[PDB]
Structures are given as structure tokens and as C-alpha cells.
């Protein structure tokens, strides 16, 4: 498992929610993706 | 998010699903995360019929 790269991506995606200015529909899917990724890689932000 | 980066990210995740040594639970979560990112960022890698 490439844990550090996955963790970097998880941090980046969290930031997209807070500073990324995405659309509502993209935000809904992204929120789900982040929850799933934290389970997949065993690391949270 | 830049489309090029989104694509690279999803490709990395697909590779982790096949080679990351994740638990069964983690693999399922990863498969769903892929669906979600494809929808969120408007690019496809795995293209599952399951993606909503
Ligand atoms: Cl496959």
C-alpha cells in the first residue's frame, strides 16, 4: 500500500471541500469519496 | 480541481485496488470511492455500471 501518497490525496480532497469552490453535486460525491478513502487506507484527516 | 490531476488520482486508486494489499473491507470502500470521484470530477477510469 502506498499509504503516504494516499494520505496526501486524502488531505488534498478534504481541502477541495473547504477551499476548492466545487459545485453542490460534485461536493456530495466528493464527501462520500473522502469517507470511503479514509476507510480504504486506514488514515483520517 | 484540475481534470488532469483528478485522472491521475483515480488511476492511482485503481492500481491500489489491484496491488495495494488492502483488506476486503478496504477494497470495497476503495471501489466505491472510485465511483464517487469519477462522478465528482467528470472523468472515468473503472467505469462501473454501479456508479451513481
Ligand atoms: Cl480490475
**What is the structure's resolution, reported in angstroms to one decimal?**
1.5
Neighboring chain B residues of A6 at a CB cutoff of 8 Å: 16
CA-only gyration radius of chain B, Å: 11
| C-alpha cell, B21 | 494489499
Fold observed for domain B1-52: 1.20.5
In the block, cell 470530477 appears at B41
Residues 6+ away with beta carbon under 8 Å from B42: B3, B6
**Test the B interface: residue of A6, A7, A14, A29 with most B CBs within 10 Å:** A29
In the block, cell 472523468 appears at B43
Dihedral-angle region of residue A42 (phi above 0 means left; psi in -120 to 50 means alpha; beta otherwise): left
Q: What's the Cα-to-Cα distance from B27 to each of A20, A42, B17, B34, B38, rounded to whole Å?
A: 27, 11, 6, 11, 17
Q: What are the boundaries of each domain within chain B?
A: 1-52
Q: How many A from CA of B26 to the centre of ligand 1?
A: 15
CATH of domain A1-45: 1.20.5.420
Amino acid at each position: 500500500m502506498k499509504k503516504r501518497l494516499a494520505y496526501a490525496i486524502i488531505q488534498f480532497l478534504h481541502d477541495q471541500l473547504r477551499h476548492g469552490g466545487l459545485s453542490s453535486d460534485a461536493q456530495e460525491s466528493l464527501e462520500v469519496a473522502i469517507q470511503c478513502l479514509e476507510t480504504a487506507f486506514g488514515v483520517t484527516v
